[PDB]
């Protein structure tokens, strides 16, 4: 609180907002992106509740609330709800006066121009920021990495991409999309557990299943052989206590759930699994740069956090590639916050501080400015 | 009683067993699935009563008895009780020697493998059937229909499903579940009648309320406008004589009870009403097959028997679908026995007689056989 | 069905088989070249479906099926699938007995010798044709035209060529290749529509986009000025109803998609646009024959069907050529079937009937015969 200034790095996630100050090593505020007020709301004797805050309160308030994601699949679809999320971010989580900070916002891949313009309009008109930037989330991640060359497999919450990069450039024609990512894997685990006679269907039960997924699932060494071991499997049958206190047993569901990344037909997806899309992406590049891609396969995103994933990707890529090809899979430790960190590096870039968009630019060429000939 | 043979078609319902001979047009035996013996049992001077027969005796014996459904929510949960129901089916209702007849059994959606194996074990070991098949009840219904394409709304006793079908295949990812169906509507009518100062709480009173529901409830043309007419409603106020002989008056409860299918929040269900699930199911299918689904919405199940339901579904679907979409609701007349009829067609399928499971198959690969690579 | 005979003219296209009788004015059978069976195949209650017929059934059966082209990029790559396509052609579409008809087959430019030999082996051994010929598809088209001199721009489904011709001879060193053609333009329209927030990614969605392309795209008068008019463009914003019934709006995508033929960098292609390749081809010819080429630029192929293409080519060629050069663009009306018609003329050539290849020639010098010293 003086001269200088930082850069409000707000990564608008499909399920979680990550926000903080440029220059910090990780976001200081992480809260669910949802909207929820009592679904039954039966009055009582007073009030003192906040209608649809969701954020952190919701979670801990599981069972009372309803949820909505105004950013459900990564694109913002409800501006009144998004204004509530940004107000919460600035005033309740970070506890800042937004008019004192240049703010860098992230946007999903394929975000419409008109959507970026509405984001810009709200920042300047509603929150009175002195400036702002919009950054592409994949791009920020790439930034955080620091690798000019290599092929990234980025699997997050709602989408997975394979992005080959040569000298810093995402050759746009090589990238392929997959709908599936963590949101789909949590829904599939709810369904397969419901196969055993359990019942996980409510909003609260979804949260419970997301926790089972993140704590007990793993990727097999070989799907077929893991299924065969399931028979005499005395390991798989882990126990998990529900908040009600009942204890369920989870066995082959531990590896059947994430097997979907390699076999999208488990959820009905025709798409090619992540090892096939990696190969298909490398084959859309020049033959010449393929050796550099094969030796620099970088994993990113929350859904690449499973133990065993790098070794499995090494095995599968080795099976598809030429016999003399050197293959290397890199996974950065704390991948998931790779998107926020790239934003932090960019926003905290004094040297490229002219890329931030300003109140004068917005007034001159409206918000589009932050879209036409920059970010 | 000679060569050839029929197929024992036993549809194990949550509230009613439907059983008969393959090839008959409808089941010859329909009896409540319950277990009940005197709750007070005060001896007397002799016996000559059957402990927990339930079946038909129970009903007519209302007030003395207790009830249990070993198939309460569609999945068999008590094998000693289920053995009693099957013994009653074979020896008391159909009056057959089970060792002379291949028998097709039905099972609920999501029935565990181990449950199908126990059903199979009992048929072969306890009843000595020469063969048997297990069939999926929804599937049998689909079979009875005869429509390859279209979206079915099947509302029965304990569950309601929306199932889109293209060329005979239930695209498994499109189907959505609802807990609510007729069991819930009877419980809700007991509760709302208890609001007027009446008291319907016992087992006998539940049966009385199920009769009021089936004889006097109806679905409104528009819920809001029907409530508004309730004021000057001189029609609604129908009379119903209780077995005690008192006469109650039923008015807006006639349409408030089934309104729950369209507004599950009446019983506290967050779920989306049946018109919303229909739309949500069609939107999980390819855009291309949607025109075929919209023109082939087939209603099935006992809870789709209300007069007015097809016209209301036509109105609601028309309001959600594109303006140029051709919408058609089909309701087969005697829907409820749609499940038994599909079983009868399948079981009575000489041409597919190799799908029946045999005593040799059970002995070789145990009962699982009737589960792994068939039904 | 008597003496004489016709010539089975089968044009094996990358996406469509065109087949018929020599002497007919157009092919009597046109069906997609694909292979597809249920991707989900969920059994049901019977069969009566044909595993991977594709042909016409597929299309109308959009959403159920998968596709494969055994001729994906013009060269046949799977002989078991190709045998199915030829069986369908003869027995289901044309309804002929192939052993009664000399059959002329077409092959892509640069088809390997061994591939032509395998085509020949199948015709004689599998279908028992009395004779057969293999013809080069470009060549057949040239044949259909009837112009000895001039430079043809032939843009079809998977490839575009510029072919200068002087007295009937394709000076082989002048011809240049382009990967891009209609297959690429349909893929690019799917991608650019997905930019607006729509989602066209499935096999069924590809077919939908191919229809939007063929019905609503057009080539601009000037790309830069058309983009500038897009702003106040109230024309562009045509509506298109999807099979689901939703209605999308298409605007600048109408001309951005085919702009790729003139600017291959839109899809990442370094190649020179079709006006530059025309000029580059004319400059590889003698200076002396250039006046004849400039006055005889003939358009051929499905991708030259856009309204406005001849006028745009006249404008662009005029801008590159010497000021006193007479420039004329010819487009034959029903260009697309230009390949089949050339085959029909050739095959129906009684006078050159000795060029057909016979069962004795195949037995003597194997199939190669139809390759070494003829077609
Ligand atoms: N340790 C972990 N193991 C597996 N999945 C994880 C782990 N940590 C986070 N995830 C999942 O990663 C997803 C979030 O990843 P993220 O990269 O932030 O996604 P997005 O950027 O698409 O919002 C969620 O589905 C979450 O459950
Ligand atoms: N005419 C009717 N009107 C309304 N509900 C009916 C009618 N006939 C039967 N039902 C109800 O339908 C339900 C039984 O339907 P059914 O399809 O057999 O269910 P399930 O297969 O789930 O056992 C019961 O709740 C019953 O009261
Ligand atoms: N009227 C049209 N306008 C634009 N493209 C068209 C038209 N008719 C056909 N096409 C396209 O032309 C291509 C087929 O042309 P064709 O000459 O048969 O190709 P090929 O011989 O390479 O198989 C397809 O991409 C198709 O969509």
Residue numbers in the entry:
A (entry chain B), B (entry chain A), C (entry chain C): 1 to 375
The authors write:
Contraction in the muscles of vertebrates and some invertebrates is regulated through the thin filaments which contain the proteins actin, tropomyosin and troponin. Troponin and tropomyosin control the interaction between myosin and actin so that contraction only takes place when the intracellular Ca2+ concentration is elevated.
The first set of 408 filaments had been treated with EGTA to induce the Ca2+-free conformation and a second set had 138 Ca2+-treated filaments. This position has previously been termed the blocked position, since the majority of myosin binding sites are obscured and access to the strong binding sites of myosin is completely blocked.
